[PDB]
Amino acid sequence: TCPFYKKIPGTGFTVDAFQYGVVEGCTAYFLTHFHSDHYAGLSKHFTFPVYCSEITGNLLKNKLHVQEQYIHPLPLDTECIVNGVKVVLLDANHCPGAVMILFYLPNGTVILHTGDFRADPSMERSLLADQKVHMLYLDTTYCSPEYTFPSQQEVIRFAINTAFEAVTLNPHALVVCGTYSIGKEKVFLAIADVLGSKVGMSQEKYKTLQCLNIPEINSLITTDMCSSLVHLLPMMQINFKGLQSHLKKCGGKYNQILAFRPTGWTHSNKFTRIADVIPQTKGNISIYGIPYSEHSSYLEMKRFVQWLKPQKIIPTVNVGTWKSRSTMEKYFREWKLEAGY
Ligand code: NI
């Protein structure tokens, strides 16, 4: 059955709760973003109203084949009424079309659901600042002090300079970027832009990108792999064997590969700076691991919560074991005692 952390008290709403069949009492199902864990269970067979951003609706329509009659896209940063209740969608700074939802309950309680998010100080000058928020449903993916990472911009700068140097030294090098869902598109778009190239990719991946309301998209991407010097492949193929194999498929048009694996955190965040990063190499193939995160670091999460001063926090990630919940509760109490709320 649908957990309490996916229910919004004193409405018939749920959030990211598509895997439990019909939820008793639910009149509107919200979807924060198009990642499979959050959409799990949605298909052409779903017949209840879904509320989401415009980008998330394009994906539902075109990739999942959800029938149009059940898709209710809402604009961002706009007060809207849904089944008699005031709501606002805000940019979550996660993947394309990802939202946080602000719910103004009839009794005067205010609830923020973050969805998946990467907390940023620009969120401190949104509609959130206009009133008190009583309850917070929080993306706790990286809620532990070891989880540090560079800014998105530091990582992109490094990627840009690395790629530019490699292709200027060898104009027959190919650049490959690994991918498994939406998100982290700036990695491959910024590399292509510095090399004067479109990004080449499979038909399924191109169809995904065509849904994302990216300006001038037709000038940036193509299905003609031949004509392009940056290619996208599934993350699982980003290894020496997969990459040599791909290089044989391209028709001797390239004689070297430089590949990037955008990952989350892995244990080597605790020493290395981005400027120290060096690749793994075997022969004419090099692979760089780059920690481009679309989740809050510990420090970004803590700052956001200490600013917001919620009366209660409800975790949405790592809630499956008592040890994790206990550890998280400890950090929330520290934050509260330091900041005086
Ligand atoms: Ni996500």
UniProtKB/Swiss-Prot annotation:
Tissue specificity as recorded in UniProt: Expressed in brain, heart, kidney, liver, pancreas, placenta and skeletal muscle.
Subcellular location: Nucleus
Highest taxon of source: Eukaryota
Induction summary: During mitosis. The mRNA encoding this protein contains an internal ribosome entry site (IRES) in its 5'-UTR. This 5'-UTR generally suppresses translation while specifically promoting expression during mitosis, when cap-dependent translation may be impaired.
Family affiliation: Belongs to the DNA repair metallo-beta-lactamase (DRMBL) family.
Subunit structure: Binds constitutively to TP53BP1. Binds CDC27, which is itself a component of the anaphase promoting complex (APC). Binds PIAS1.
Function: May be required for DNA interstrand cross-link repair. Also required for checkpoint mediated cell cycle arrest in early prophase in response to mitotic spindle poisons. Possesses beta-lactamase activity, catalyzing the hydrolysis of penicillin G and nitrocefin. Exhibits no activity towards other beta-lactam antibiotic classes including cephalosporins (cefotaxime) and carbapenems (imipenem).
Name of protein: DNA cross-link repair 1A protein
Record organism: Homo sapiens (Human)
Phylogenetic lineage: Eukaryota, Metazoa, Chordata, Craniata, Vertebrata
Residues of the full protein shown: 700 to 1040 of 1040
